[PDB]
Design a protein around this ligand. Structure first.
Ligand code: SF4
Ligand code: SF4
Ligand code: SF4
Ligand code: SF4
Ligand code: FES
Ligand code: MG
Ligand code: MG
Length: 578
């Protein structure tokens, strides 16, 4: 068919929207509420307005192209409409970009500038108490920024299928929030933060821990440990104009030292620990025959999903603590034993791509003798802001190393941040443990990739077992509801709340819709992790020399005695009541 756009003739056969056809042909059309192939069906922002000859003004983001169409995207009538919509949004938006946390990458600000729009009356409330919800340990809402674009609502539905984020009618006004306007933590919400990643403005944010950290750094008697997650070294560089998929590991260690942290360790070291305990546990359940299947328990998003939707599976979860929590436990016990520090004075901080990790760290029972496993969790975004505030030229920094005692990590622990990572890492150790050997081929590419549900047959000690990798909370629901759990006998299953793995977590850097269609962010970030695994001398968790001497000198045998006593954590369904 034939269509005219701004005087240019196109002969196409494709059946698609005006917006996406224009994007494919270097024609600029603005958009706001359109994301993940969905717009706000109930309250269209109409930023994507174009003019179709013979019809009038139409929304390009949900209008299909058709033969005989003559389209104009930059007429005066079009621009007047768009500018008007942005103006109306400014009438309900506290326009103070100064101290805003989305100052450097806000979609709305760029639209205001582009169309040079202004408010009819500047929205200025001098008491944001009614507009702000900070009850959650993971999420925060500022409704002075909310455009009601519904992107959070759609994102939650598609990613989790919980629909925990909803449109609400608060006193006759329309808002977004949790069920019955409750605290998110008190609902079926997973605290995965996918609603944040979809937010075009600073309406949705993580619960800040930056004050916890700064007060600890300035406390004379406090010894502050810092340790980053796998995905951070593959991501944070984006917020310093370094592009995508840049390994900035060495730069982070340097920046963390200039920030004043007293010790530089790594969560990947803790990931090797989780494997030591979990791989041991897998071999245990084999010889004891069950309980099968065993589910991973390192994702607090999936834990909450199980607790809220599938409590009968809680006993099937691995007792091994998550890399963050298992690391923290050792930071307050093992680390003082080799440093002389008073355990009370140790302050453990982690850097995560995750908002759910905040809720996990503040779990009441996640402590021992009054000492928290983890005292503070800051996101990838929070660390980046901390660096810029201290005016540290991150991009120019020289590479340094972490402190080895709890900083060394194998390639197995390095790939934790990608879907199927824990699965593969665990099989590298579990296979050696059961067969009592040191195998050569350790790459399980069948469990890798962005497929929603991934299963494979593996052979452990002359016997075949079935494993599965659930990629995204929505795929867990699919996996269970469709009855795939019963089709065959599974023995070991990985579950991750965020599709793509932790590299796509809720605490990660925002990426505008434009770059997302250009870049496979989930694969580009993950590639950094796998590339480290390929070049590392040690590619098995139990070959981690620093970890070996820790177990030899302090803990003992994994899955036994002391190691089982303090490095493990069991979830149990609530007892019967009425
Ligand atoms: S949300 Fe965006 S436009 Fe609004 S104050 Fe913050 S940076 Fe400025
Ligand atoms: S919180 Fe963000 S994504 Fe949700 S409606 Fe408001 S502006 Fe849109
Ligand atoms: S944190 Fe996750 S589950 Fe909770 S509302 Fe946001 S997207 Fe939905
Ligand atoms: S997949 Fe990773 S980032 Fe996402 S909720 Fe789970 S632990 Fe957090
Ligand atoms: S982007 Fe088309 S209606 Fe919002
Ligand atoms: Mg629609
Ligand atoms: Mg200090």
């Amino acid at each position: 068919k034939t269509i005219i756009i701004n005087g240019v003739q196109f002969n196409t056969d494709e059946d698609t929207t005006i917006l996406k056809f224009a994007r494919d042909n270097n024609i600029d059309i603005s958009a706001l509420c359109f994301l993940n192939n969905c717009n706000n069906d109930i309250n269209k922002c109409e930023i994507c307005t174009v003019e179709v000859e013979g019809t009038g003004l139409v929304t390009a983001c949900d209008t299909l192209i058709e033969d005989g169409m003559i389209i104009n995207t930059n007429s005066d009538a079009v621009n007047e409409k768009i500018k008007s919509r942005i103006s109306q949004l400014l009438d309900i938006h506290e326009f103070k970009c100064g101290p805003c946390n989305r100052r450097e990458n806000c979609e709305f600000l760029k639209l205001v500038i582009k169309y040079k729009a202004r408010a009819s009356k500047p929205f200025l409330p001098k008491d944001k108490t009614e507009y702000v919800d900070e009850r959650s340990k993971s999420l925060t809402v500022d409704r002075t920024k909310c455009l009601l674009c519904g992107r959070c609502v759609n994102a939650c539905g598609k990613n989790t299928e919980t629909y925990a984020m909803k449109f609400l009618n608060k006193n006759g006004k329309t808002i977004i929030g949790a069920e019955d306007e409750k605290c998110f933590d008190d609902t079926n919400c997973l605290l995965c933060g996918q609603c944040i990643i979809a937010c075009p403005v600073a309406a949705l944010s993580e619960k800040s821990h930056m004050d916890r950290v700064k007060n600890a750094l300035n406390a004379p008697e406090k010894h502050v440990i810092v340790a980053m997650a796998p995905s951070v070294r593959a991501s944070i560089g984006e917020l310093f104009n370094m592009g995508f998929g840049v390994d900035v590991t060495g730069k982070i260690y340097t920046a963390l030292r200039q920030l004043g942290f007293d010790k530089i360790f790594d969560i990947n070291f803790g990931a090797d620990m989780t494997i030591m305990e979990e791989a041991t546990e897998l071999v245990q359940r084999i010889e004891n025959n069950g309980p099968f299947p065993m589910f991973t328990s390192c994702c607090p998003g999936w834990v909450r999903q199980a607790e809220n939707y599938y409590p009968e599976l809680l006993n099937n979860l691995s007792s091994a603590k998550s890399p963050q929590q298992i690391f923290g436990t050792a930071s307050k016990t093992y680390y003082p034993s080799i440093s002389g520090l008073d355990p009370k004075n140790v302050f453990t901080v982690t850097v995560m791509p995750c908002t759910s990790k905040k809720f996990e760290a503040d779990r009441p029972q996640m402590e021992k003798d009054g000492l928290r496993d983890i005292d503070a969790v800051i996101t990838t975004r929070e660390l980046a802001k901390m660096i810029k505030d201290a005016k540290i030229p991150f991009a120019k920094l020289e590479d340094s190393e972490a402190d080895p005692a709890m900083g060394e990590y194998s390639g197995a622990g390095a790939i934790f941040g990608a879907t199927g990572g824990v699965m593969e890492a665990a099989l590298r150790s579990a296979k050696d443990f059961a067969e009592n050997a040191e195998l050569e081929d350790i790459e399980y590419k069948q469990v890798r990739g962005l497929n929603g549900i991934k299963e494979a047959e593996v052979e452990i000690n002359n016997n075949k077992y079935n494993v599965a990798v659930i990629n995204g909370a929505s795929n867990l629901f699919k996996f269970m509801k469709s009855g795939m759990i019963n089709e065959k006998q599974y023995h070991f299953i990985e579950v991750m709340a965020c599709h793509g793995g932790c590299v796509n977590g809720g605490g990660q850097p925002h990426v505008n819709p434009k770059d997302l269609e250009k870049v496979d962010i989930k694969k580009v970030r993950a590639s950094v992790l796998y590339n480290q695994d390929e070049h590392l001398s040690k590619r098995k968790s139990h070959e981690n020399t620093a970890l070996v001497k820790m177990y030899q000198n302090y803990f003992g045998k994994p899955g036994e005695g002391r190691a089982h006593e303090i490095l493990h954590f069991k979830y149990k369904k609530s007892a019967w009541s009425h």
